[PDB]
Amino acid sequence: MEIAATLQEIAKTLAEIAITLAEIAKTLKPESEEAKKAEEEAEKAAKEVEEAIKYAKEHPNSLEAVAKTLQAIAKTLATIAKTLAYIAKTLKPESEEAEKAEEEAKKAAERTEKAIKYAQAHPNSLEAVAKTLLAIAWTLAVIAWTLAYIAKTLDPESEEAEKAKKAAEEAKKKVEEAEKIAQKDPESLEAVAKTLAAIAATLAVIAKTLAYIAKTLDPKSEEAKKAKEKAEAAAKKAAEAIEKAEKDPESLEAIAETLKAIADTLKVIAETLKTIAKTLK
């Protein structure tokens, strides 16, 4: 269908997400240098997203356009994970899980830095695409784990908090299986489809966890209540695409449908995050 165009939409939504998350950090800690750095890095990521989108529009349907957009997506997710771990550290400064989130986000950024290095040395290679996609998947797994920790911190007595933790662990297992498949044959579409499937499953967990957080932060907000059904519909859409991707892992149609589900889930996440950003003000 429209692989390259859908990646441009994914990159744009992630840039908006990074900016909103930096606004939340500044709302929680107005005088902190970390929230200042979060805003500066989110702006830098948005600039690289803009540059990649303009480059791809001029080189339609090319491996280079795909690689450059995936690199912007990976860098944007790296700063999201770092800023989110800082937020988790703000809620419970002396908690060991907060220190673990910061360490996990740092390691995800190093993996992202190494994948981009390889991709820049092999811009005409599918191995570069699969490597960058795996860095994206691992960073999303860190985000999902950190977000489930935040959810548990707001209401440790809640069954939904443990459901988010278990869901994040299952998405991590999907990333681990994708990394195994890609390592065995990184120049096949199988590696791309299975890694995209893990990404879609992880974003589905994130969207449902984020909708729970919005509702917990503002039980009387009608916008926050609506995020549950919206995240569930996006999660069902991802589940459909994942089933196609594991049925025909070398299908271009399966790859396209999975990218569409990723883009749609990110739109729900971005909307939900905006509701949270207003709640905290």
Author numbering: 0 to 280
What did the publication describing this PDB structure actually write?
Here we describe efficient routes starting from validated parallel and antiparallel peptide assemblies to design two families of α-helical barrel proteins with central channels that bind small molecules. Computational designs are seeded by the sequences and structures of defined de novo oligomeric barrel-forming peptides, and adjacent helices are connected by loop building. For targets with antiparallel helices, short loops are sufficient. However, targets with parallel helices require longer connectors; namely, an outer layer of helix–turn–helix–turn–helix motifs that are packed onto the barrels.
Encouraged by the successful design of sc-apCC-6 and sc-CC-7, we extended the seeded design approaches to target α-helical barrel proteins with five, six and eight central helices. By contrast, the six- and eight-helix-based targets bound dye, consistent with accessible cavities, which were confirmed by SEC-SAXS and X-ray crystal structures solved using molecular replacement. Together, these additional designs delivered the de novo proteins sc-CC-5, sc-CC-6 and sc-CC-8. The five-helix-based proteins showed no dye binding, although an X-ray crystal structure revealed an open barrel. Thus, the cavities of five-helix-based barrels appear to be too narrow to accommodate dye. For the parallel targets, the experimental structures show minor fraying at the C termini of the inner helices compared with the seeds and models, which appears to improve the packing of the external three-helix bundles. However, the symmetry of the central parallel helices is maintained. The backbone RMSD values for the repeating helix–turn–helix–turn–helix motifs are ≤0.5 Å, which is expected given the low sequence variation in the loops and the hydrophobic cores of these buttressing helices.
